[PDB]
Structure 1
Amino acid sequence: HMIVLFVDFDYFYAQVEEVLNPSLKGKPVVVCVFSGRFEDSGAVATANYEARKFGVKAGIPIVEAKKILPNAVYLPMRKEVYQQVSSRIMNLLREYSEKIEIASIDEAYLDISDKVRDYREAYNLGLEIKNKILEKEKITVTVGISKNKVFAKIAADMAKPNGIKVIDDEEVKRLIRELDIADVPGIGNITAEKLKKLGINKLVDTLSIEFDKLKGMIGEAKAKYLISLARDEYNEPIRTRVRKSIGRIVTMKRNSRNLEEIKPYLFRAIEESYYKLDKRIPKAIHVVAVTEDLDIVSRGRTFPHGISKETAYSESVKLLQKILEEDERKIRRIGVRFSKFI
C-alpha cells in the first residue's frame, strides 16, 4: 500500500489565457510563438480542445493552423504569467502533502500513502483537489491515481481532459499485457521503433528478451525501467526536484554564418538568461546552435568558479567560433544554457 496521486493541468497555457480573459472560453484558442522570420512564422505551443478536435495542436506551424481555422483566436505566448499562475497552484498542492515532486510547469506527483488508506479515499481527495484548484485559480486539471508514479500518470492520460481516474492493481496487471508499449512514459517514437524490431509491442514482452540484448538497443536505465514495470516491481520515490539549468534560445531573422551578424542575438540570449538565473550563479556554460536543417549543435565549458556576465559574453563568442569551425552549415537559431549552480 503506497498510493500516488498525479496532477496535470489541461491545455495549460491556453487555459490561462481563458482565465485572464473569459470572453475566450468556448472558442478555438491557439497560443503561438511567432519566431518573426516572416508573416506568421513560428509554431504552436498549445491549443485548447475546441481547436484540437480539428487538427490544430502543439508543434504544427502557425501558417498551417490558419489554413485550418482562419478565425480561431491566435495569442502570443506569455511564459512569465503561466509560470506565476503555476507556482500558486503548486502551493495549493503542498497543502495536501509533504511529499511532492514537481515534474514540469504543469505536472506534479503527490505521495498520499499516509493521508489516505485506500483507493476510494484517494478518489475523494482527488475530486477535492480538483474542486479546490477550480475555485481558487479557476483551472481544470486531470488527476490520475495508482500504485506508482508511472501508472498514476498513465491513468491521467486516459482520463483527460478535466478528469479523474484510478488504476487499481487488477487493471495494472492487465495493462502490463494489453497497454501499448508506446503509451508508457519515457517511450518516444525512437524508443518505440527500436522495441518494434526486438518484437516488444507490450510491457510483458520485455521479459521474453535476454537482458543484454535490450541493454544494447535502448540503454541500461531504460531496460531496467521497463523490466521492473513488467515484473511490477517499479516503485520510485517522490523526491522534490530542483532546476538544474537555465537558458534561452532565439531565432535569427535570416540563417547566417557571419559572426558579427549572430553576436547580437547571442548576447540578447545571455541577458535574458541572467535575468532568469536571478541570484543563481552557474559554473557551466553551453552555447547552443540550431542549423538550417534543424539539427542541434552545441559546445560548452565548466569553470572552477561561477561565471560572471562579462565572462559569459566573452566565453560564448569563443564557443560560437568553435561551432562554426567544426560545423560548416548555416545557423538558424542561437542560444545559451547555464548550469551547475553554486
Structure 2
Amino acid sequence: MIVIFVDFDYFFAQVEEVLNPQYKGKPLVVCVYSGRTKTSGAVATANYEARKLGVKAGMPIIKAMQIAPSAIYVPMRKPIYEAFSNRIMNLLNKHADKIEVASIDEAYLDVTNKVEGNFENGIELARKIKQEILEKEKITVTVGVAPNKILAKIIADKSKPNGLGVIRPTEVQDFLNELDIDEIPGIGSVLARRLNELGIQKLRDILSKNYNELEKITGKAKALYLLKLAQNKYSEPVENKSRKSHGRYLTLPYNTRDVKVILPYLKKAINEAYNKVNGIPMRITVIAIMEDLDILSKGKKFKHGISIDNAYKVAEDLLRELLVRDKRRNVRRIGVKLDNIIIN
C-alpha cells in the first residue's frame, strides 16, 4: 500500500497570512474570544514566529500576551478556514484513489493505483501536490509518504513545517524499531506515562512483553494496535467517514447555576447545532463546562428522531438534571451535541 498524508502548516494562522500578507514574517496568533472580557479566550493557532516566543495552541490568551505582547492577535474566522480546506481537499481529490479527510487540516490519500504501484512515483506525486497547493492556494503543507496511514502521519509530523517526509518499505522495519513510543498516534500522554516508566518506552518493547500485562495498561484495542505496529503488520485502509455529530458551544455572559439564565443560550446552541445536521438526530447530549473547566454531560437517545422544538424541551430537562447532579458549581460554558443522525 502507499499513503500520502497531508497536514496544512500552522493552518488557521497561515490562512490569515494569505488573506493579509502584512501579517507574514511577524508573530501572529489566532484566538478564540469567549466574549466574557476583551482577552478571555484560548489560542487556536500561532504562526511559527509566535511559537518562537512560547505561544502554544490551547493556551489562555492573556498567557500568550505576557510572553508575546507584540504579536498580532486576530479572532478566529472558522468559516474562511473551512472554505480554504474544502478547496484544498478538492485538489487532493483528483490525485487519490481514496481520500480520508481526517480533519479540517489533514487527509490521507491512497495513491497505490495512481502511481502505478511504484513507491518513487508516489514521492514525485507528493511533490507535485505540495507545488499545486502552494501555486493555487498559496498554502504550504507538510506531507508523509509511507506504506500505511499511521506511518505517513508519523514521518510527516517529524518533517513539519513545509516538509516532505518519506519511509520506504525497506526502512520500515528499521524505523519501527528506532521508533520511540510517544511518537505513536492514538496514545495519550497519560497512556504514555503509565506505560513509559513501567517497562515500555520504545515500540519494539511491547514485542518482548506479553499481552496480559498490556491489555490492562491500555486496553485490548490499543494493545493489539501497538502489537500489530511493532511487527509491521498494521494496514488500515483509507476510508472517508461521514461526520457523526454536530455541536455548538457558548460561553455564558457570566457564571451561573440558574437554568432560567442559561436556557436562552442553550436554545441558541440547539438552533445552531441543528442547522448543521443533514438530518434528524436521535440523540441529544447537553454539556456543561463548570467554573473550574470541569466537564459534565447528560444525554438521551430516543427510538425516533428529535425535532428541534422537541430538542428544546429535552435539553432543558437534561440541563436541569445536570444541575441536580452537581449542586454547587456554577456553569461557565454550555454546549449541546446532536448525533445518531437519521440521514436525509
TM-score by length of 2: 0.96
Per the alignment, residue 187 of structure 1 pairs with: 187
| Contact 1:182/1:192 (8 A) holds in 2 | yes
1:267-306 to structure 2, matched below 5 A, reads 267-277=267-277, 279-306=278-305
Per the alignment, residue 34 of structure 1 pairs with: 33
State the 1:285 CA deviation. Answer: 0.5
Per the alignment, residue 122 of structure 1 pairs with: 122
| Contact 1:6/1:153 (8 A) holds in 2 | yes
Hey, what's the Cα distance between the residues in 2 that align with 1:53 and 1:171?
33
- Provide, for residues 73-123 of structure 1, a one-character-per-residue CA deviation record: whole Å limited to 9, x for no partner: 110001111111111111101101131111111110001112223332121
Gaps of 5+ in 1: none
TM-score by length of 1: 0.96
Hey, what's the Cα distance between the residues in 1 that align with 2:37 and 2:15?
27
Per the alignment, residue 232 of structure 1 pairs with: 232
State the 1:261 CA deviation. Answer: 1.5
1:52-91 to structure 2, matched below 5 A, reads 52-91=51-90
The one-letter code matched in structure 1 to 2:253 is K
State the 1:330 CA deviation. Answer: 2.2
| Contact 2:97/2:112 (8 A) holds in 1 | no
Give the CA RMSD over aligned residues: 1.3
1:176-325 to structure 2, matched below 5 A, reads 176-277=176-277, 279-325=278-324
Hey, what's the Cα distance between the residues in 2 that align with 1:97 and 1:174?
28
State the 1:339 CA deviation. Answer: 0.3
| Contact 2:97/2:113 (8 A) holds in 1 | no
State the 1:170 CA deviation. Answer: 3.9
Q: Percent identity among equivalent residues? A: 55
1:340 maps to 2:340: yes
State the 1:259 CA deviation. Answer: 1.1
Per the alignment, residue 24 of structure 2 pairs with: 25
Per the alignment, residue 5 of structure 2 pairs with: 6
Hey, what's the Cα distance between the residues in 1 that align with 2:11 and 2:304?
38
Hey, what's the Cα distance between the residues in 2 that align with 1:153 and 1:164?
11
- Provide, for residues 159-206 of structure 1, a one-character-per-residue CA deviation record: whole Å limited to 9, x for no partner: 111110111234332332222211111112111012124311011111
State the 1:155 CA deviation. Answer: 0.8
- Provide, for residues 121-147 of structure 1, a one-character-per-residue CA deviation record: whole Å limited to 9, x for no partner: 121101100111111111111110111
| Contact 1:101/1:238 (8 A) holds in 2 | yes
1:154 maps to 2:134: no
The one-letter code matched in structure 1 to 2:192 is A
SS at match of 2:135: helix
Hey, what's the Cα distance between the residues in 1 that align with 2:197 and 2:250?
38
State the 1:294 CA deviation. Answer: 1.7
Hey, what's the Cα distance between the residues in 1 that align with 2:288 and 2:334?
5
Hey, what's the Cα distance between the residues in 1 that align with 2:124 and 2:331?
53
SS at match of 2:320: helix
The one-letter code matched in structure 2 to 1:10 is D
Per the alignment, residue 91 of structure 2 pairs with: 92
SS at match of 2:30: strand
Q: 71-80 vs 109-118, which deviates more?
A: 109-118
Aligned structure 1 segments of 4 or more residues deviating by more than 3 angstroms = none
Hey, what's the Cα distance between the residues in 2 that align with 1:65 and 1:88?
31
SS at match of 1:206: helix
Hey, what's the Cα distance between the residues in 2 that align with 1:253 and 1:143?
42
| Contact 1:109/1:238 (8 A) holds in 2 | yes
| Contact 1:142/1:162 (8 A) holds in 2 | yes
SS at match of 2:103: coil
- Provide, for residues 10-47 of structure 1, a one-character-per-residue CA deviation record: whole Å limited to 9, x for no partner: 11111111111222211111000111222301110000
| Contact 2:150/2:185 (8 A) holds in 1 | yes
The one-letter code matched in structure 2 to 1:33 is V
Hey, what's the Cα distance between the residues in 1 that align with 2:323 and 2:197?
38
| Contact 2:54/2:68 (8 A) holds in 1 | no
Q: Matched residue pairs, number?
A: 340
| Contact 2:10/2:45 (8 A) holds in 1 | yes
Hey, what's the Cα distance between the residues in 2 that align with 1:98 and 1:172?
23
